[PDB]
Amino acid sequence: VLPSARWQYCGAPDGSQRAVLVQFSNGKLQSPGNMRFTLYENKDSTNPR
Amino acid sequence: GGLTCASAPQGTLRILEGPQQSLSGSPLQPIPASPPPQIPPGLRPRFCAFG
């Protein structure tokens, strides 16, 4: 194989440091129209569950 | 943190374990055939006719 790439695991392990990937149960998007995306998380970060 | 919609991805990498096949592909090792029944050595006429 001629194409290749050098791996580099960048980014520290953290919650919102993860990129987010989105699906939709009603179809494909095909047009992002002014969709305000907002990601919420729990206040307690000390218990692992 | 506006979380805009990014572009479509180019492709897909998929990582999975590969099996090792240095063992298999060898010559087969079957169960050895049981021998056919051979006559025992040292068989003699034990019965002699009376008189």
Shortest distance between the Cα of B17 and any Cα of chain A, in A, equals 18
The whole-angstrom separation of Cα A45 and Cα A49 is: 9
Residue with structure tokens 């307690």?
A44
Shortest distance between the Cα of B18 and any Cα of chain A, in A, equals 18
The whole-angstrom separation of Cα B11 and Cα A46 is: 37
> CA nearest A32 in B: which residue?
B5
CA B12 to chain centre: 36
Experimental method: cryo-EM
Give the residue among B39, B22, B3, B41 at the shortest CA–CA distance from A35: B3
The whole-angstrom separation of Cα A32 and Cα A35 is: 7
Q: Tell me whether residues B3 and A32 touch, CB distance under 8 A.
A: no
